[model samples]
Structure formats: C-alpha cells, structure tokens
Target: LVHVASVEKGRSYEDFQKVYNAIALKLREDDEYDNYIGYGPVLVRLAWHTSGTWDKHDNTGGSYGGTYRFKKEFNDPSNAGLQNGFKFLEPIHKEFPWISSGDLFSLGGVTAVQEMQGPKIPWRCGRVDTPEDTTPDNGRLPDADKDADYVRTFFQRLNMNDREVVALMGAHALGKTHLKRSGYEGPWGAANNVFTNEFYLNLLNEDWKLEKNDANNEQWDSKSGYMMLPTXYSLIQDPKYLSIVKEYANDQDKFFKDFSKAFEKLLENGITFPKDAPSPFIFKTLEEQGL
Candidate 1:
C-alpha cells in the first residue's frame, strides 16, 4: 500500500502560515550559506530532490511519504548537500512539532522560493512520515552526466512532459552546483539567490566551453564563472527543448507563471488529496507583511 499525508487534528491555514513565517524569517537570518546565496537554493533543491523520487508507475518515493527522514534515503549519495537544508529546518520543526516531515520538507522549498522573490507556489499539507523500509533505494534520481534524451526519459518516470520538464529545469536559476556534491561546480548565473530566467539567458548568451572540474568530470564553463551540466546544455542542443529555453529567456513573467504551476504539480505528485481537504495555501512572503 502507498503512504499518504493526512491533516493533523485542529490544523488549518493559520498553522501553516506560522510555519511559513518561521521558515522565511530564518531564511533572512541564515544569509551566509554558499558564499552568501543563503539557504534558499538548497532548500528548493531539497524539496525537488525529495519529490522527484516518485515513480508514477508504482506510486513510490514521492513527497507524500516523507521517507527521506530515514537513514537510508538521507544518506543517499544524491542527497549529499541536502543535510544542511534539513539541519536548517530542524529548529522550526522543533517549534512546530505537529507538522509532518513531508509537509515541512516540501513547504520549506515553497517558503524559500517566495521569500527569495520568486513565484508564489500554492501549497497543501498532509505528508506523513513512513517507515525506513519503505524508503526508495538510491539511483532513482537523475544523473547530470547524460544527454537530452536521458534527461527526458528520466523525468518521464515522474510523469512530467516536455513543457513541464523545461519549466521545472528553470529552477537551476536559483543555486550553484558543488563539485563535491554532484561532481559539478559554479553558479548558473550571478544572481544565485534571486530566482529569474537567468539560467536560460546564460545558456543562450554565454560562450561556454567544454571543460573539466578538478575532479575530472566534464561540464560546460563560461568566462563569467558559470557552468552547466551536460544535461542542462542538452536543453539548447535539442531543437524542441531549445525553443522553450528561448521562451523562458525572453519572458520572465511567463517563466514565473509556468514555474509556479510546474512546481506545485511536482510537489503534489502521487498524492490522493481528499475532496474535503483544504484548498491549496498561498503564503504571504515576509516582504508582504513588512516584518
């Protein structure tokens, strides 16, 4: 049987609002991570990597299980840098102990993105913790070293289509890659903390050269100190994906709107939200409240 998140007793929008506020506040406070890009990017990555594990075929390894708390999944090689995101969320979880692991992990990303001035993602809560035995084995995550076809086929397991895949990949705009973490290094663009269409812009505009990192892994590097994995470069290398890349590069509003939709769908995959469940919550950013 598949695991699912159910609302805690006496929970509502206000409870999640407080949780969202706490996360945003801490994001402001923790500004020194990754050379001052802050925790936003990694938090967003944490949410994606967690939800990306779902296999629509078998209904396993999605955000609904929150199984990343288990040691096996936590220690997976693909999760190398996410422990920091988890540590950052620990105190908030302590303050609001009733929130499920799945909910907090996913919501942390939503809060991070909106607070960083990205699109507002409508979030719903109900992810529950499941046993360690149910955690998916490693190697389910995508590899950065592959071509465009591999990238397309990998996301198919999660039921994402061409438009959705291009939209979701736009998230590379938010953070730099680490050589130690994924055998890749360098930011996708200068404004690593601020979410924008910069990844597509840089990809289309940069004079990138195929180069090797210190670890001897191949990646595309630009003179501006940016890098893209083979999988990322494949977006422009393929004709169809290239068109969408140009679209996002040319229009920021369109990128944000598409990203918001795709992100919400990515988070909600493999869930069976009850018809009576609360509508998706769009939390106010700290800026909106003047805190």
Candidate 2:
C-alpha cells in the first residue's frame, strides 16, 4: 500500500464535491465532439484505461495515481489520441490543482457516466500516486488483434468473470476505438457519444462483415455504417455471452445497472480501502437533478 504522499487539494468532502461539480459543468459545455457524441465515450475510455492498469496479485498500477499526466504512460502508443480526454480535463485540473492525478482521472469518469444518463456508480477517494518508474508496462491493455479466448484470459488476471467482461465491453457503445490510438478504428454504433444498449443491438442485428479496418485489424462492419471490434463482436458469437448480450441490449435499464456495477469493480480492483470509508457514492446526474 503506497499511500499517496501528495495531499488532496480539498480539505474536506465539500471541497471535493465542488470540484466534482466544476467537472460536471464543463462536460455539459463540451458536448460538440466526435460527431456530437460528446466527451462521454472518451471519458469512459479514460476511466477504463486508468483503472485498466491494475493487476490483481501485487496491486501495482491503477486509476489511483492518475499518472497519465506523465509522458511514459500517456505516450504509450496504445493510449494515442486519448490526448483528447486529457485536454478535456486540463482546465478542470487547473481549477483544482491540488487534487491527485489518480483521483481526478478516476473521478472525471465518475462524473461523465452519471452525467450521461448512466447509473449511479459507487465511488471512493483514496488512491495515491506513484513515481514514473512504477507505471505498468504498455502491453497491459488488451490487443485489438485477439479473440474471445484471449480476451477472457487477459481479464482473468484482473479477476473478472465472463459476465463482467461482456458488460464492460458494452462500453464500446460510448466511444470509438481510434486506429491511431489503439490500432483499431470505428465507432460501435451511430451514437458513439451516448451511453446505451446500442452496442449490443448492433452486434446482434447488423449483418457485420469481417474486414480489415484502416489499421489493418479485423473489425465487424455493417450496412448502417457502423463497426465493432472482432473481440466485441465475439460476445454474441459464443452462445453463452449472447444470452447476456441480448439481455443488456434489449433492456436499457439493466445495461445501465449492470454496466455500473461491473465498471466500478473494474476500476477498484487492486486497491485497499479503510474500514470507515463510505461504500460507494451513487451521485445524482445533472439531468436527473435538473441542474
């Protein structure tokens, strides 16, 4: 447990709450990106990548540190073009400079999901930052070139089950995988910015063609002019995952509910928390509150 030596800028929860509000307001203001899908997808990807760094055994890297501010992790070829997400967060970071990068990056994700009509994902605030040397090696993220078996094996190291992996991949509905950034390209659905069951629907309904994307990777393309990574398309191809895929795709509420739980678990995988800490903060979205 490398306790973050860096102090949180907010002296109390109220201050952090205000910081969270500022981020929420900005996300509302910045709704014009990526064919009007807004920053929702990139924000989830940010949180996903941030938390994706965690390893189950030793608890080495994760969203706790927010080390994406540094070049080594940020510049990892796999993270390319996610500069969009960081640039999106820069102003908020300036307004509240004292918050640890780990906290800000993870919290930005919390704010994004809630704002985008998603579920009230529970969250906590105790991750500490590590030095540059501690950043995990680049290959930690899944290769777009892999299969269901490979995807399943990779997530096991993070302690995820088949159901959780299916739920998490549904997040592809929100953001496109950039060829430059991930060696894969195309949005999973037309509404690449909105959080919905579209990814699952697209997977099942569309007559997807197995073709090499601009990046020369296999992706499922369709008549509606949408795409899905072969791995994403894999969920429904296997009869087992198809059952859950149909459930999530058809039931929006269930997708939001299940995705929230699975995503929270993914983000918090390798960290420790004190006993007195709050369980999970299911914060209200701006839309839900009519703010």
Candidate 3:
C-alpha cells in the first residue's frame, strides 16, 4: 500500500511554531539590508536555488538536505549573490541551533512570502543534514540569459507546470539582477521589495525593449528602467504562459494561492521520511499571530 510520512517526532507543533516565529522575527529586523527591501526576496531565492537542484530520475538534489553551508555549494555561480542570505540567517541559526538547516531554509521561504504579503504556506520539519558531498552542482538554478523554452524545460524536471513556472518567476518582481552576481542588473519592478502580481502586470503592461545592461547582458528593460530576464519576460510573450500571466495579473488572490502551493512543492522536493512520521503542517505566519 502507498503511504505518506511527515515531519519527525519530538519536534512538536508548538516547537515548530517557535522556529517559525524565530524566522518571522528576524525577517522583520532585516528590513534595512536591501535598500529597506528586507531579506525576504534573497531568502526565497536561496530556497529556490537550493531546491532547484533536483533530478527527477534520481531525486538527489533538492531542499531535502539544506547543504548550502559548505564552501563549494556557497561558491556556486547560480548562488552568486546569496551569501547575503546565508549571513542574514546566521544570527537566527546561532540563536536556535537545534533547528535543522533544511527546516530553516524551508521556513525562510514560507516566512518571506507571508511577510511580503504573498501567502501563508504549509510547512513541515524533519529534514536531517546530509554529508557535504550531497550538494548539487551550480548550474541547477535557471539561467537568466535563456529563453522561454529553456525556462519551461528546466522547471519540468522539478515537476513545475507552465502556470507554476510563470508564477514562480514572478518572484523576479522582488529582487534585482546584480551585475556582479548574474551578469544582469536592474529590478523587475519598482516595488521589488513586496510580493505582488506586479511582475506579471509589468510584463504585460510595460513597454520593454531589448537593451544591454551594465553587465553587457542583453535583457528586456522597460523605458521606465525596470528590467526582466529574457526568460522571465517570456511568460507574457508565450501564449500558454501569457494566459496564466493575465489570470494572475487580474487576480492577485489566485496568484498568491498558487504560489504558496508551488513554493511548498519546491521546498519539499527530494525529501523523504520514515513511514510513521506525521503530516505536513501549515505554520502560522507572523501576521496571522499579530506578532
């Protein structure tokens, strides 16, 4: 018979909630890091880059291990500018050493979305840290230089549908392309700090032009100075992705709902547990708790 497991025992719902609170609390304090944009975007990017390493055939490199601490993984080109995120979490980790890195990363994603006013994600915590060798290679994260097909093909391995892919990339609305990091520069939105359908809205409504940025990578930039990775911009240009873009742009609630689902899937990828484990949990966002 087929069965599903869950977050390990001993770490009660209340304890997990405490971990969630730790993440939520730190997120609130880190608002000054990125031009008052907070650490949410980079944290989400960290979770995405960490989990994006999964290979369907083997299911090896996903958020299961949370091995981003080691030098090799941290030095990954795909994780170019993410050292900031790791540093950002250092204090929280020091304060709560018992929480697994895997759990922290996953919780950070959920916290980022909820704090950014996106969605409240259901999360679980049982991932044990594996050996350093378990880390995936650098290129697993999507390239900002690629085309729509490339983006779609890359995410298909992660089991992301076209709609999910577009919604996930809408995260671009939060973070900027650092030239030194990914050879791309400029933000995808004016309010890149907040989570919103503005990425899709900007993609559809902004007049984008192919321009060479400070890094000399050609990307589509709006006359208003906002920019989008070629692959990110493809969401609106492609017929299939464009449909979902319009849907999300028109319905913020739907986008938030779908993003929470897809983000959870991304965070939980490549993870497995014992048969007797409990169920996945929906942690209380700081906002929900009025904290």
Candidate 4:
C-alpha cells in the first residue's frame, strides 16, 4: 500500500517557497472572511479534509492523489464550505500550473499555519495528479456528531494514536464550524486565525453542556461563546486522552511540537518517499523574511 512520490521536474525548494509566498500574500489580502478571521482556518481544514481521507489499510484516498480537484471529491457532503478554500487556491494554481493539485493544497495549509503564527510544519512535494476516478468516495471524513469511541475508531483507520489524535484535534482552535458546512456552528476559540493549544485549554477548563444547535445536532456549548464538537469532548471521556489534553492545555510549546510532528505525518500518509527524495521543507514565515 505504499505509493512512491514522483517529484515534479525542474522544481526545487525555491520554487516551492515562491508558491508559499503567493499563498501568504493572498492570505494577507483576503482579510474579509469571517469578520477578518481570514482564510487560514478554511485552508488548514481543506488540507486536513483532503489528507484525512487516507486509509492506512489500502492507501486509496491520500493527499498523494490530489483527486480533490475532481467533482466527486469536491461535491462531497463533508466538503460543503471548502469550495471557498479551493477557490482561494485556484488563482495560485493557474499561476503555478506546474505544481500538482495535491502539493498546492497541502502546501497551502503549511503556509497558512506558519503565517498565522502556528508551528512550522515541514512538508515535502511529490504528489502527482490523479484522475477523477481516483477520487475517494464521500463519507471518508469523520462525522462531527460522533462520540469518543467513534473518534478513536475513525482515526485508527488513519493510524493515529491517542496522543496524535489529541494533538491534531487541537487544530480545532483555528476555525469556527459553519452551520451550513458541518451542521455545527461557532468558533472553538477566540482567535480563529491563530493556532494554539487553546482548544485543549478550552476543553479542559470550560463548563460545557450538551446542547442542540440550530441544526438540531448535539454539541458541547459553553457560556463564553465557544463551542466544541461531541468528538472534541470525547478526549475527556477517555482517561488516556484526558491526560494528553491536560498536558497540551498546560504547555503551548509541547502542543506545538507534537502538532507539528503529527500534522506532518497526517499530510504524508500513504505516500512513499524515495531514499533520494529531498528532505521535508520548513518554509519561513513572511515576518522572518521581512516581507
């Protein structure tokens, strides 16, 4: 189930950096979304949703295929609000048509994370274009309404352990769920554009209640105007996950480091990098380069 990466010809680190710069610039320009929450969250979610489809069993729906560009994948119910993220990347794709869809999509998330002052997620590019037929069927993504057991079972398909699952779910701090998009609404934290261990902190500290949303779907709600998916609250339901959640809530640095590692692994799922392939690239933020 290991698919080898086929590097795009005549490309190197600088080339990818240029793409990163373009995405960063656009993120800065597109400041009108979600009352200036910007496009960061959706971009990260787009990357996650695209990569989350990987099945460690057969490797059919990984980021390696880039089949998200096709109709079936784009039209997936789980992908409702993601068209915005796709349209955001469309112009970049046109300008850098040489970059594979998978590379551009995954890199968009990496760039957004760093630009939003999140951790540096090292990334590699070698995903080739996949045809429409290669697109994964809908329902591969996790259900927002599920419980702890479902959350554990779902991620097990992707081979993520308890720690990895908790670390990655901390990403919920980055964006608000759209009622239209996920049948769940509200931000997971105050700073929707910035990535932090806030999700873990909120989960541990909040006095949450089981409530129904406008869509009649049950979620954990708090008085502080924040919300959590039932699956998010599941961390506390399991002692092992609860311990990791407490650790992340206590230390932001550890959360960032673990998240960086888990996120990179999530992005690279099902791809087989050759021994000669270039090392993962950790792009510098715009501030680092004085942009």
Per-residue lDDT over 171-221 for candidate 2, one digit per residue giving the tens place of the 0 to 100 score: 777767667677677778886656778888889888988988786777888
Q: If scored against the real structure, what TM-score would every candidate get?
A: 0.98, 0.92, 0.94, 0.98
Per residue, candidate 1 scores C-alpha lDDT tens digits across 1-291 of 555558977899999999999999999998998889999999999999899899999988999878889888889999999999999999999999999988999999999999989998999998888878889999899999999999899999989888899999999998888978888999899999998889999999999999989989999999999999999999999998999999999999999999999999999999988888889999998889898
Point out the worst 10-residue segment of candidate 2 by lDDT.
Answer: 1-10
Candidate 4, 103-131: lDDT as tens digits: 99899999999999999999999998877
Model 3 bad stretches (over 4 Å): 1-9, 273-276
Kindly give the stretch of ten consecutive residues in candidate 3 with the minimal lDDT sum: 1-10
| Cα RMSD for predicted model 1 | 0.9
lDDT of 2 at 119: 73
Which residue window of length 10 is worst by lDDT in model 4?
Answer: 1-10
- Model 3 over residues 105-174: C-alpha lDDT tens digits? 7787777877787777888678777789887776777777877888889888999999889778778878
